[PDB]
Amino acid sequence: SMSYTWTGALITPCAAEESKLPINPLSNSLLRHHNMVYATTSRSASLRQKKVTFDRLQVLDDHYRDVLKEMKAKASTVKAKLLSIEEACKLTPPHSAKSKFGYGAKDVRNLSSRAVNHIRSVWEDLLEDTETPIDTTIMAKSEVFCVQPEKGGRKPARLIVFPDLGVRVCEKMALYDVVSTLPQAVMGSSYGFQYSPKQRVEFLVNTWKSKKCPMGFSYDTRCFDSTVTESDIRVEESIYQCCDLAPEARQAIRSLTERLYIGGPLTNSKGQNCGYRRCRASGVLTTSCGNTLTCYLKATAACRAAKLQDCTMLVNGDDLVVICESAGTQEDAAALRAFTEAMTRYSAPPGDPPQPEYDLELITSCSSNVSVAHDASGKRVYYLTRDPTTPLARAAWETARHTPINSWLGNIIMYAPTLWARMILMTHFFSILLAQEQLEKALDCQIYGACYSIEPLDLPQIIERLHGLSAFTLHSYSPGEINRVASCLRKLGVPPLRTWRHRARSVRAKLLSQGGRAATCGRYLFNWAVRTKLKLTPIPAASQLDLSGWFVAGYSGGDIYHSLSR
Ligand SMILES: O=c1ccn([C@@H]2O[C@H](COP(=O)(O)OP(=O)(O)OP(=O)(O)O)[C@@H](O)[C@H]2O)c(=O)[nH]1
Ligand SMILES: [Mn+2]
Ligand SMILES: [Mn+2]
């Protein structure tokens, strides 16, 4: 079975597309080499299709079935709720793509009669029609990155596939509770999205330490969605089916599984049939959960086949990292060879062969890695970092062009503890906000795939709640880590780290002599920039009325929104 079949019609864009970074009178303050930044467009959709299109051979053995059951027994433990039309409407983001039936996200969240009437029929249809493939739209995703060291090396557009708005709301009523609860229940501490960065770190380390002689690695499959089979999707459904569900929920899931999740026809923006999918759809509510479960299921089985000792995994979508007891170098190399031979068999071959690692700071996953620093008292603190090239490039692009979702904000949140996050991002953006007094204007950013509405003035609280205070006092980052950041600044033409020490004192000052919420931002966010450092006390309101539901589950491509946590 082929992951895709193409009729020749083009993946077309729904609007015009900006691909280059125009000469900015403020972004150059950030990055000077504009020709290094680029956003993906329809033009490269075909290169993507070729990467994404191939036959799938899958062989399932005893360990796989053994693991399936263990997972199912756990899922058996869950009672999932049917979400009401209203609840699901609220979960829809304000700029979620509009329906082909004459209403948009706004209409849906406002509970328009037209919108709710269509949703109801889409739901009724889920109960009356058990087999007709549901229409999906295929588009090229616009994403900004830095040119490849191979000079002019570019990533082709990634393809996004999703059903009409109406179906999406139905998916929510039918599966939102499930997709928010089953992953943990089934994978325990192995489910990654349940952890804030601070927790993901605690869990990696306490695990690494828990080993007499630790050996670890990260695994990532070559274009995972395409590797997901119809079989894999039905197994996924067998897992969902073990929950106690309402009758209509149970049929909605069952119908959604055959009509949408296993495959369906592909339609472009001009309304033409581009082909057919027989693999995971990037834009359905189940794709995060589905991928984690499938990833976890295959990997657990692979461990037992490769006979790895005391394996402990952490899974996020298709992002896998396993920490086991080293059984000797030579030994370890053969185990990963086997592990991979098994993953490949289960229909999930690697992008790059996994390398056994013996230094936790050396294992990278989710595009991130753990690093060490020291706090106020110099007590070796641990945190999560990542190469800053893509983040800095995106910050650049978001500066020259108001985009709907502001990744820089998100990166500050998740990476607040980091060197680059504090010294460049925090500095750059707080002066831009200062200038236009956009401190109060809330922005949309996403975490683990769900879009969140956030007020910059609340970063101290948020940062404090998530990383602790050490996030405001880390000071002796690793050589390795500092070298990476500097090397990257050179690559992008971003002014060296010390140039930023300067900029911050200013911004901060212009933030202390501002009072209120703005002022606090000034005291806590740039304490690394002032000569005369003060002693930061736990923020009152922060570790208080600060909302949650933030690190419960992944919703990438799931059309999820929350306007909580100020
Ligand atoms: O919302 C989405 C979209 C995509 N995917 C799928 O999960 C994988 C996570 O993508 P990766 O970071 O693994 O990149 P890759 O090397 O596997 O594939 P290239 O993207 O760089 O082409 C993607 O490659 C995609 O196929 C999801 O799981 N969820
Ligand atoms: Mn992948
Ligand atoms: Mn990945």
Swiss-Prot record:
Q: How is its activity regulated?
A: Activity is up-regulated by PRK2/PKN2-mediated phosphorylation.
The record's account of how the chain is modified after translation: The N-terminus is phosphorylated by host PRK2/PKN2.
Binding positions (Mg(2+) 2):
220, 318-319
* Cofactor notes: Binds 2 magnesium ion that constitute a dinuclear catalytic metal center.
Where in the cell does this protein reside?
A: Host cytoplasm; Host endoplasmic reticulum membrane
Q: Please give the catalytic activity noted in the UniProt record.
A: RNA(n) + a ribonucleoside 5'-triphosphate = RNA(n+1) + diphosphate
Give the record's membrane topology: Single-pass type IV membrane protein
Q: Which residues form the RdRp catalytic domain?
A: 214-332
What's this chain's function? Answer: RNA-dependent RNA polymerase that performs primer-template recognition and RNA synthesis during viral replication. Initiates RNA transcription/replication at a flavin adenine dinucleotide (FAD), resulting in a 5'- FAD cap on viral RNAs. In this way, recognition of viral 5' RNA by host pattern recognition receptors can be bypassed, thereby evading activation of antiviral pathways.
- Protein's recorded name: RNA-directed RNA polymerase
- Say which species the protein is native to: Hepatitis C virus genotype 1b (strain HC-J4)
- According to the record, which residues of the full protein are present here? 2420 to 2985 of 3010
